[PDB]
Amino acid sequence: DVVMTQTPLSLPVSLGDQASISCRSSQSLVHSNGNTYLNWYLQKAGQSPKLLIYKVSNRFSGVPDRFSGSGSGTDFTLKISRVEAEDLGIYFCSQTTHVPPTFGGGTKLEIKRADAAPTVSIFPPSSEQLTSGGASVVCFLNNFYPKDINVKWKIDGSERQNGVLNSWTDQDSKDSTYSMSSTLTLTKDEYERHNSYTCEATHKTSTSPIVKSFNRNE
């Protein structure tokens, strides 16, 4: 197994920009038959992977002139000269010199924009649900930029872990902002014997954590 490390992990570009993705193997990829077997793929939104370059610099059929590959041994780069909108998606690098084939973790190309701050909203369990005997307190952190955000749940001063279901939106094709959802699910029994509930977002735009709270009756 040869680790393929690839950086950036996310590369924000404006359409029209130059882009470069770096990839390094943990061993040389120069095989005994004289070849360095390093290939590059692009998986656009929810499609299958598509080969772009093979044997470091060989462009595959129908891949445009914009895309290029280079390097040797352990160190490689996929270059795009003008990021057209069509190019946005996840690029991986795979090696086929050593057994098994391995792949890097991918470099998400995304559209750059101005940091937005989360529009946190917390929601008390519904009558209905409390009648069911269960209680989800939900928290929507709608429309922030960048996607590195950190949600914590607090009940009465100690932090909370068992019961958090977390999910996320991809870059919205309108305002380039992400949104993620957090849901904490506990008993009607444990909800009734506690009182302040705190969806406490940490985002990189504020030094000040965004705290939406409510108190079951306090």
Binding site: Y37, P101, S121, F123, T169, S181
Partner: protein, 217 residues
């Protein structure tokens, strides 16, 4: 060169799934069929290869035992059988072909998703989410709706029969143990709710379910 893959399966725990892949129109070449698992979003894990002409298999040493590769030379039909399926094995599985010299996967199948879950069709519970919580930001009200414990997917949610379509954010479902859960939020102006009605619409066709939750004040 075209590859057709058998589409989605829902396997029980500690069970097996056989998966097919038919290669077409790259007749006469010595090429191999490859299986690559894509764990979730970005990790691709190479499972193995098999030549439909000769029978030469080769596994990634991590999958040998979990996966059995076979081909019907006579049909150009490769097979992958995965046995003792765990929740962990719920991924998309690709089939793709390589063709000598270069050693890259140059043609790829559409993917095969396997959801490993011990559930039978389970109907969702739809819960209105009123922002009573943390009082309106002035101009905007955000309302939510939570769809809990349904198997299999999908459910579909719209707001006000799709008359409300802007500022809606619908979140991908997540397999909450062996069931799914998903939510959505809509942002209306503060004069609108409740003077105008906003209603969560849900239908889980796999269980004949259709529900409308007006998010009452």
């Amino acid at each position: 060169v075209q590859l057709q893959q058998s589409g989605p399966e829902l396997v029980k725990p500690g069970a097996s799934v056989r998966m097919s892949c038919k290669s077409s129109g790259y007749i006469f070449t010595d090429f191999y069929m490859n299986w690559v698992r894509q764990s979730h979003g970005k990790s691709l894990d190479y499972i193995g290869y098999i030549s439909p002409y000769s029978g030469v298999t080769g596994y990634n040493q991590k999958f040998k035992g979990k996966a059995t590769l076979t081909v019907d030379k006579s049909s150009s039909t490769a097979y992958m059988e995965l046995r003792s399926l765990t929740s962990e094995d719920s991924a998309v599985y690709y089939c793709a072909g390589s063709s000598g010299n270069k050693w890259a996967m140059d043609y790829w199948g559409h993917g095969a998703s396997v959801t490993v879950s011990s559930a039978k069709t389970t109907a969702p519970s739809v819960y209105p989410l009123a922002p009573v919580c943390g009082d309106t930001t002035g101009s905007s009200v955000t309302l939510g709706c939570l769809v809990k414990g349904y198997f299999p997917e999908p459910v579909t949610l719209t707001w006000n029969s799709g008359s409300l379509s802007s500022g809606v954010h619908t979140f991908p479902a997540v397999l909450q143990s062996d069931l799914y859960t998903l939510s959505s939020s809509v942002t209306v102006t503060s004069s609108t709710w409740p003077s105008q009605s906003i209603t969560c619409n849900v239908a889980h066709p796999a269980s004949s379910t259709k529900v409308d939750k007006k998010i009452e004040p």
